[PDB]
Design a protein around this ligand. Sequence first.
Ligand SMILES: *[C@H](O)[C@H](C[C@@H]1CCNC1=O)NC(=O)[C@H](CC(C)C)NC(=O)OC1(CC)COCOC1
Ligand SMILES: *[C@H](O)[C@H](C[C@@H]1CCNC1=O)NC(=O)[C@H](CC(C)C)NC(=O)OC1(CC)COCOC1
Lengths: 298, 297
Amino acid sequence: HHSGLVKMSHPSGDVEACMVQVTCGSMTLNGLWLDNTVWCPRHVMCPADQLSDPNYDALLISMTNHSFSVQKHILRVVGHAMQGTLLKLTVDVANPSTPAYTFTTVKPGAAFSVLACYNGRPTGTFTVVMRPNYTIKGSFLCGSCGSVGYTKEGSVINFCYMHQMELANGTHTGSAFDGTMYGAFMDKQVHQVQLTDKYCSVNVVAWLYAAILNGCAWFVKPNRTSVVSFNEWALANQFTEFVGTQSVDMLAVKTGVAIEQLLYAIQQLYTGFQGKQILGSTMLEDEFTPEDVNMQIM
Amino acid sequence: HHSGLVKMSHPSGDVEACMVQVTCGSMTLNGLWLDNTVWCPRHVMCPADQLSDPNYDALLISMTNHSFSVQKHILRVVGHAMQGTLLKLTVDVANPSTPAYTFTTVKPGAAFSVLACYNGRPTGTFTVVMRPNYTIKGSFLCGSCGSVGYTKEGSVINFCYMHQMELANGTHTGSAFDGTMYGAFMDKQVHQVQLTDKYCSVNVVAWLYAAILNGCAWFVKPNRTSVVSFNEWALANQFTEFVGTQSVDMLAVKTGVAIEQLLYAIQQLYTGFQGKQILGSTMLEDEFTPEDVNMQI
Ligand SMILES: *[C@H](O)[C@H](C[C@@H]1CCNC1=O)NC(=O)[C@H](CC(C)C)NC(=O)OC1(CC)COCOC1
Ligand SMILES: *[C@H](O)[C@H](C[C@@H]1CCNC1=O)NC(=O)[C@H](CC(C)C)NC(=O)OC1(CC)COCOC1
């Protein structure tokens, strides 16, 4: 039986209307236009020559307002400032289609939608999970910097990601809109090695609950492992700490299966399913959130 | 090395601007507002009483323009007609934000984006492949009917799907905008026979080309299988006919690996990967198209 559990993104129309192109010298990339502000990665300031150790503080000082061209395809710069790894440009027109929005940094295990853009033009959207080593997968090519990641709750878009770089293992990372880089990677063209990744324990729990809701519960036993005990074990076996949420609790109430029975199951299943499948899979899946499962299976 | 091959959907803003809610008596679902026309599934006319064997001809005749209610959230009806499994409702206002569009019927193995909506409100977007048995997977709950699927060529939107139903096995189907149901399923709540699914051969090829581009070419051999022999083999082993395309050919040039080497490879991998993985998988993957791979790698 097909569960209906799929990778689902937020509808992108609200964010499409905020995308612009930003150009500084030879470098061109994407920006986010909210009210009188345009956000973009500060390495737009850097010519290809100096990208391997840029001096951003000096590059900023060398700019004037005319050093930045902002074009909408889908504007006069009247101020420029740097905030961590982002530029905050002030323009003289308020974006007439600005959504209600917040700037909240996301934590590992949380999912968000990405609007991939090139030269200020949206081309595709996908959902990613912020990994425990502060990278994301997804699909990003040359020109994609400034593409944004977001969630939506009610009318309020939460902007959580602005794309900056690809790592040698092909994963990606970027900034929060407070200017910090996820994982503290440097916006320098240099080899940087991401830390070891981990299974997102709370999302594995959610997926097992999706399995139960879908009629697949051969892995459920009476046996349990406490949260506190599971977390001691998680540290030493490449799992995140489990932190419960009202979203997980809803799934436990619906199924009648306790969180702690699934923490025991995870300790038995992460080595393999001994020939069985769970939701068409032979390994544990950690990129569906408790919210995904509540939204899509209930 | 993560390939960067992911399930990607089209930006949905153009289509979001066309979604409305359609209400008829006590039933409510989504509709697509293009110019002066609102498209929605005809079963909005059916009371819960009679979902098993609705008489859509008599239901239509019993309706008047005032039977229908159309609200834009993200309108007065002055005309109603039935086209196959869809209603075509004429409203007095023409949608100002109507994109350039066409209507197409997608074929098995082709990918399209779906804007899932509830009560006229877009809530999510995902990409599906029309399966060889004319069903799709995806995620659709109660209230999702009238959600639409589409591709793009340029800024042109090609509307190809309007969601209608879920089958006993959890898969889904819908209408093309000429009113025909994909796979000729009936818009009634009765058990109906679904053909067995098959691997979409051309997409498996594209997936192996993506593996090669990503530096995973252990399955590659100079052993070849002609398209014709492959096609013969595919009938007895639950695979679709391979049909080359310009898009596949590009991939054979980028990698310098011939189609027939991968056809040969498919025959062997179907019997097993023999301890090895391909792009993190131990089974063949057939929901990534040649166009996906060309665009994403
Ligand atoms: C901005 O559009 C760039 C996006 C990456 C290009 C390929 N895929 C991407 O996601 N970002 C960069 O090019 C970035 C600039 C520095 C932070 C100053 N460098 C980068 O992503 O690094 C490499 C590998 C070390 C990525 O792969 C291509 O070579 C550069
Ligand atoms: C319209 O929004 C409905 C969408 C489905 C409901 C649950 N998931 C869906 O995709 N469509 C229907 O309710 C449909 C109406 C008939 C075509 C007249 N019924 C339906 O999808 O079939 C059932 C039973 C075969 C699927 O299983 C649950 O009950 C409905």
